Amino acid sequence: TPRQKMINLMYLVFIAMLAMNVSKEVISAFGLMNEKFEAANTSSVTTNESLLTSLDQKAAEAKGEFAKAAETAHKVQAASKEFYDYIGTLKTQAVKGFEVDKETGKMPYEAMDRGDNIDDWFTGDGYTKKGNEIIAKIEKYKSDIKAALGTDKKYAGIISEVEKKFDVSDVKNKEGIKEKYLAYHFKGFPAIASAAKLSAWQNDVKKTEADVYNSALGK
Amino acid sequence: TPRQKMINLMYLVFIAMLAMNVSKEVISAFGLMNEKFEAANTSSVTTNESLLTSLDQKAAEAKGEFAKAAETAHKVQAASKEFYDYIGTLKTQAVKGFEVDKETGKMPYEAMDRGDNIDDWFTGDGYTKKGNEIIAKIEKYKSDIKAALGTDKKYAGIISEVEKKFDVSDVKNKEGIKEKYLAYHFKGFPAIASAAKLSAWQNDVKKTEADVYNSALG
Amino acid sequence: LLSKKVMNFAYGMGAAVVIVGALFKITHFEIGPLTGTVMLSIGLLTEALIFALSAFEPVE
Amino acid sequence: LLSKKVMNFAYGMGAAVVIVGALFKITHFEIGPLTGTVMLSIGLLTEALIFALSAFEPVE
Amino acid sequence: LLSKKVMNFAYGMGAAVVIVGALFKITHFEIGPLTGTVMLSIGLLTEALIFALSAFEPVE
Amino acid sequence: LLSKKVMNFAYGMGAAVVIVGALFKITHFEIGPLTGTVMLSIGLLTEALIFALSAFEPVE
Amino acid sequence: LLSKKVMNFAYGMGAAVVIVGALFKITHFEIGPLTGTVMLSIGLLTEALIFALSAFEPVE
């Protein structure tokens, strides 16, 4: 039995190989990334709060261009706040049913493996009525960005950036067909990956608010 | 061969399962947040230059606590730039081999699913004389921040967050058994995942530089 | 006791479901609510059972 | 029911084709329309049906 | 050397607990204070003793 | 068209190369430009060659 | 060329040491300087040596 003895040993060695393969962390890598993103969100909301009240104080003392920039700042503030809290509701939908580990203060990142809580956004190759509401919210946010920020030459860079950052159109897959947006970015993902990308959108919204703020007070 | 067939079948199954195990998804998310992390750290370094410019401008206007803040800022600037370009060297070593696709600008994320480029970082159970200096660089970074930015209560939160982000000491996995730091985080990841985590370390380095600059003026 | 036809049926069908479960695990094509890992779990579970209970007959 | 020679040949060729499928899976070179994943799946399924239909004929 | 009863049962039970441990490790499901790795290690250990003490008699 | 003179040679050499390939993968080496997934891609390819020529003597 | 008994005993002890080395590899405790990998490497190299020099007797 020449190859046999080989196969009886290498069976358990490959068990050890798979055990070294499956253990690791990989999926749990988002949890440090989601934690860094959420800490960046918690920092950016505070520094942009100080930025908006500094621009508010400046528009209170020297009104005019500061007042018009503060009006645009408050409009993007309200639209960004509505989009931020809506993305937060989608995120709490994304982690619905996953507790904390009490002592560690970290979610079971090994357990948040499937995206089986937001199956109510797709039907086969189409969406549901909720996913169409999400696409409507994203397009409403992109359009009120484009409508609050006018045709100013200083702001067209961030208009083109949010059109780049929040493109909604079909993207080609690896096989070369078109594919709808939330089916491409979320259908089948892990839930911690979904909350990670939604917090990336939150970081994008706070970054956009920061850019229009420090370009607004510079204006 | 009564139950022997099952065994050979187990051999076949687990020699098949030592193929790709992270999916045609999740590494897609790794690439997306790698692009997000890289755009974010590019934006952060471009505003960090202006932060330190305003910082040493106010220091040159009035010295004292401003000047001491400028000195510890330039020390942590040099140390963080050393660590930053070293992690950049590790990241280019991590994505070395896969051609960046032209026109679009994104690497093939369906291709980078094996961490072979960082296989020379460690000899299995422990590091080698490529990874021991990575460990030495991390501990050097911690000690030079703690030595320059030191004996101050306004930066105690900063240095505690630095030592909270960079625990070189071993970590317990889902079971609770400990394992070396660059073996838990980099052994057998996707190469896009290792580049993502290294760019995340670059993001934490620039975040450290950002709030030590903000604390220098705040 | 598991009889001869039932033992053979387990000895083949657990093998078949653990093969297609390994397939669904390493390719992430999951049809419906089966999701691959549950098929692999059922396969390895019944394989563990059939591997356990077939250790009680020392027939030579 | 099929022949044991066909059974052994199919099991062997299926094992060979699934291992070279995992080879293309971990290396990403494909010649033509094979692309690994297709080859991996047809390999696993071909030796799945072997383990399936052999588990009905009880002969010994 | 050990008894034939505690040879085949040890071999089979160790070959089954390693499989259910690999199952526990690929599924993140532990029930009690087992967590797979304990079961996987006791399986590899109980097979290590079999490969150890069966290296003494070549009987044919 | 296979002879028995090289059959055991093929079985042993393929066993040796797949074992040293797994060895290089779970101990991490640096010899030349391989260090795993390089010798293993030779190793399981040779294993695929064995499993190809495994079912070419169907005698019972 | 070695005797049949020493090859079999070396196969047994080599399998034992590589499996307990894998046990150290998946659990990470090293007692002294054994460090898992060392036991793993010496077991796999002894096994590769055996499977090399057992690929040269055409016995049938």
Side-chain angles (χ1 to χ4, degrees):
Chain A
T1 75
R3 139 147 290 224
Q4 210 36 25
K5 308 155 88 51
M6 160 210 154
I7 210 170
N8 289 13
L9 174 68
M10 202 39 62
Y11 148 68
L12 291 148
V13 187
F14 282 159
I15 289 295
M17 288 212 58
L18 187 79
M20 285 297 307
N21 205 335
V22 184
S23 295
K24 293 179 179 179
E25 183 178 2
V26 45
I27 298 150
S28 159
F30 298 98
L32 299 177
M33 292 148 103
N34 177 40
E35 193 166 352
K36 287 162 204 304
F37 272 132
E38 279 175 334
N41 298 315
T42 321
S43 67
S44 47
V45 60
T46 309
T47 180
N48 292 146
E49 268 184 325
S50 49
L51 276 164
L52 63 88
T53 183
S54 63
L55 196 46
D56 263 348
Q57 285 276 329
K58 214 49 193 186
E61 52 213 52
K63 42 184 68 175
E65 189 47 72
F66 294 91
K68 183 77 173 306
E71 286 162 69
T72 64
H74 270 278
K75 286 171 184 181
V76 70
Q77 185 259 333
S80 54
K81 267 300 292 169
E82 178 50 45
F83 193 35
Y84 184 87
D85 290 63
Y86 185 49
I87 290 295
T89 56
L90 310 171
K91 184 196 305 147
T92 49
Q93 182 160 351
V95 295
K96 170 198 299 162
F98 281 120
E99 282 265 12
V100 202
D101 210 354
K102 188 181 179 296
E103 311 295 321
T104 78
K106 278 180 39 204
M107 289 173 277
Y109 293 134
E110 41 167 345
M112 302 152 71
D113 197 14
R114 314 209 208 86
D116 298 355
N117 57 76
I118 45 170
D119 280 284
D120 68 326
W121 295 2
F122 325 112
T123 46
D125 295 356
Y127 294 162
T128 69
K129 67 164 297 300
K130 174 63 170 304
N132 300 302
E133 156 70 17
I134 303 173
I135 302 287
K137 272 270 195 186
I138 293 157
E139 260 289 344
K140 182 197 171 319
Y141 172 65
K142 193 246 176 177
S143 45
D144 59 42
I145 290 295
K146 234 167 181 180
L149 292 91
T151 82
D152 216 326
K153 54 173 70 183
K154 311 287 184 176
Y155 290 168
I158 206 57
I159 303 165
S160 49
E161 274 283 357
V162 185
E163 194 160 72
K164 253 195 198 171
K165 283 160 175 294
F166 280 118
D167 50 53
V168 193
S169 69
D170 274 354
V171 199
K172 290 279 212 80
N173 61 336
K174 65 163 153 67
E175 304 301 280
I177 78 180
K178 312 304 292 290
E179 191 36 74
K180 303 196 82 66
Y181 192 67
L182 300 190
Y184 175 53
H185 283 268
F186 292 88
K187 190 169 176 183
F189 270 39
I192 182 56
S194 318
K197 213 178 291 204
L198 285 158
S199 61
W201 281 350
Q202 280 182 309
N203 193 12
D204 202 303
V205 181
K206 288 313 170 208
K207 179 176 173 304
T208 312
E209 183 190 348
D211 300 324
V212 304
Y213 276 179
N214 53 13
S215 51
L217 63 100
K219 192 75 215 82
Chain B
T1 74
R3 119 185 118 235
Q4 192 54 188
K5 220 169 15 142
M6 216 78 123
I7 319 262
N8 305 341
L9 187 73
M10 306 310 284
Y11 175 79
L12 190 62
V13 164
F14 293 117
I15 203 167
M17 215 180 309
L18 57 86
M20 183 200 89
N21 300 137
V22 62
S23 38
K24 303 159 134 197
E25 35 210 3
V26 194
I27 57 190
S28 318
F30 270 122
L32 191 146
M33 268 171 293
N34 174 40
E35 190 172 356
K36 294 291 179 174
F37 271 138
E38 288 189 298
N41 53 61
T42 307
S43 64
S44 67
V45 64
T46 44
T47 182
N48 275 324
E49 288 256 14
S50 179
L51 289 151
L52 61 89
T53 303
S54 158
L55 179 45
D56 82 309
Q57 169 173 323
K58 259 68 177 178
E61 283 184 14
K63 305 277 193 294
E65 290 287 323
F66 281 71
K68 181 59 177 173
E71 300 317 281
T72 183
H74 262 273
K75 286 168 83 183
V76 76
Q77 188 256 335
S80 50
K81 273 283 173 179
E82 281 196 326
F83 192 32
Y84 184 25
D85 292 77
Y86 186 61
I87 299 285
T89 294
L90 310 174
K91 198 196 308 148
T92 42
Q93 201 262 325
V95 295
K96 163 72 152 39
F98 307 99
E99 291 290 328
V100 49
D101 172 64
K102 265 74 186 173
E103 310 95 30
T104 46
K106 50 172 293 160
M107 316 168 188
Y109 296 146
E110 73 267 57
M112 307 151 59
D113 64 326
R114 296 292 315 175
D116 269 330
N117 294 321
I118 53 174
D119 192 56
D120 66 334
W121 273 23
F122 32 76
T123 171
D125 44 353
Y127 316 102
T128 179
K129 210 46 71 192
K130 179 52 213 177
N132 261 310
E133 58 261 57
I134 312 181
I135 296 290
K137 271 305 170 206
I138 297 156
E139 296 268 12
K140 204 193 161 299
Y141 181 66
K142 296 168 58 183
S143 44
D144 62 49
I145 292 181
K146 200 186 164 56
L149 203 70
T151 50
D152 207 307
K153 55 198 68 48
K154 308 290 285 186
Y155 306 101
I158 307 299
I159 54 185
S160 53
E161 201 53 51
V162 161
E163 301 197 341
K164 186 50 193 78
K165 283 168 184 174
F166 280 121
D167 305 70
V168 202
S169 45
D170 44 359
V171 286
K172 311 183 170 178
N173 55 349
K174 62 183 163 222
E175 274 79 42
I177 49 179
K178 287 174 277 302
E179 178 58 20
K180 304 280 191 172
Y181 186 65
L182 303 196
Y184 175 66
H185 279 260
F186 293 92
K187 187 149 147 177
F189 272 10
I192 183 54
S194 313
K197 206 172 282 215
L198 283 156
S199 61
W201 283 3
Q202 286 189 332
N203 191 15
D204 306 299
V205 163
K206 302 322 274 186
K207 180 183 195 305
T208 294
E209 200 187 336
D211 50 16
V212 72
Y213 287 169
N214 294 143
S215 297
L217 198 141
Chain C
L1 184 51
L2 277 301
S3 71
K4 294 309 287 190
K5 54 188 184 293
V6 193
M7 183 198 49
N8 188 270
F9 180 75
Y11 189 89
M13 262 298 177
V17 67
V18 74
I19 283 287
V20 64
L23 165 64
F24 274 22
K25 181 61 156 64
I26 67 179
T27 47
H28 313 83
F29 286 154
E30 68 264 52
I31 308 184
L34 299 169
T35 197
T37 314
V38 190
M39 268 151 68
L40 183 43
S41 88
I42 285 307
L44 285 182
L45 196 69
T46 67
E47 273 312 321
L49 311 182
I50 192 63
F51 223 168
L53 62 96
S54 54
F56 288 166
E57 299 291 327
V59 53
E60 66 175 291
Chain D
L1 72 163
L2 310 176
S3 177
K4 288 286 309 303
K5 309 188 158 223
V6 192
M7 211 64 45
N8 288 317
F9 172 72
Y11 162 67
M13 260 305 301
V17 72
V18 63
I19 292 170
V20 68
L23 176 62
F24 287 174
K25 192 77 163 175
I26 65 186
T27 44
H28 299 163
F29 65 97
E30 68 269 357
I31 308 168
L34 300 168
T35 72
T37 309
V38 181
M39 188 150 78
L40 177 55
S41 44
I42 63 175
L44 287 165
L45 283 174
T46 43
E47 50 83 21
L49 312 172
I50 293 314
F51 268 85
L53 69 95
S54 43
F56 284 115
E57 308 294 291
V59 307
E60 76 273 17
Chain E
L1 262 298
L2 318 181
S3 190
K4 191 59 76 64
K5 178 202 186 302
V6 72
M7 168 80 43
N8 165 259
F9 154 72
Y11 178 48
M13 196 79 186
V17 63
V18 63
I19 291 177
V20 74
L23 154 67
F24 271 29
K25 198 158 277 292
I26 63 180
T27 48
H28 301 160
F29 186 73
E30 63 261 45
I31 303 98
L34 299 157
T35 51
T37 305
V38 185
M39 323 217 306
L40 189 57
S41 47
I42 197 182
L44 286 154
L45 182 52
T46 39
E47 292 269 349
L49 312 183
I50 297 312
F51 276 161
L53 72 94
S54 54
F56 297 130
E57 305 278 27
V59 285
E60 66 268 29
Chain F
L1 199 143
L2 269 300
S3 195
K4 206 182 178 309
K5 161 72 188 69
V6 296
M7 197 60 51
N8 274 30
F9 171 73
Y11 264 144
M13 286 301 294
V17 63
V18 75
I19 286 172
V20 68
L23 160 62
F24 283 164
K25 197 175 188 319
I26 68 181
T27 68
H28 305 207
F29 248 136
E30 95 267 32
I31 62 147
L34 344 158
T35 84
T37 85
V38 192
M39 69 293 291
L40 176 85
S41 312
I42 310 300
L44 58 93
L45 170 143
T46 39
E47 194 69 41
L49 289 181
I50 302 187
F51 264 119
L53 62 96
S54 47
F56 276 137
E57 277 298 321
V59 68
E60 55 265 45
Chain G
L1 183 67
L2 310 182
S3 79
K4 196 170 193 67
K5 259 281 202 181
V6 69
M7 289 190 293
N8 199 4
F9 161 69
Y11 160 69
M13 258 297 167
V17 64
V18 66
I19 285 176
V20 67
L23 194 150
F24 284 158
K25 190 51 165 55
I26 67 177
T27 64
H28 320 131
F29 69 100
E30 56 261 43
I31 314 155
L34 283 162
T35 188
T37 305
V38 158
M39 301 178 73
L40 191 69
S41 43
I42 193 55
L44 285 154
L45 289 155
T46 39
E47 280 290 344
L49 271 185
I50 289 157
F51 278 122
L53 62 97
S54 51
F56 289 120
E57 206 59 60
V59 281
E60 81 273 39

